[PDB]
């Protein structure tokens, strides 16, 4: 379904498998992420990956319950959610690392790309 991007309907305790697609391995050099928008705030960070595969970091919310992955031809990355909340309701954005002027974490170093994913929890 959706509206401006796509919609993603799941109860607490869920899971889902967001995933992004670019052609022709657009994002094999690059660093990749997921950020989020929960309505009001921010945009925050929530996850990021390596070209190499390798080196995953989390938000400290998102920590221990989300993995991110990667295939190797640069074309996906997938965002694997586990143990939704109602806190976790936001609109999901994948997002190429183009600039370099902070950590990995930052959100500012960070391009949304393609279209976003709004996940609503339904406690």
């Known amino acids: 379904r959706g509206s401006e991007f796509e919609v993603q309907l799941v109860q607490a305790g869920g899971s889902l498998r967001l995933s992004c697609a670019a052609s022709?391995?657009?994002?094999?050099?690059?660093?990749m992420g997921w950020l989020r928008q929960a309505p009001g705030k921010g945009t925050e960070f929530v996850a990021a990956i390596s070209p190499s595969g390798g080196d995953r970091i989390y938000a400290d919310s998102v920590k221990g319950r989300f993995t991110i992955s990667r295939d190797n031809a640069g074309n996906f990355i997938y965002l694997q959610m586990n143990s939704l909340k109602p806190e976790d309701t936001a609109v999901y954005y994948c997002?190429?690392?183009?600039?370099?002027?902070?950590?990995?974490?930052?959100?500012?170093?960070?391009?949304?790309w393609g279209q976003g994913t709004l996940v609503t929890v339904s406690s």
């Open positions: 997002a190429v690392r183009r600039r370099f002027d902070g950590t990995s974490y930052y959100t500012g170093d960070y391009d949304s």
């Open positions: 022709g391995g657009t994002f094999a050099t690059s660093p």
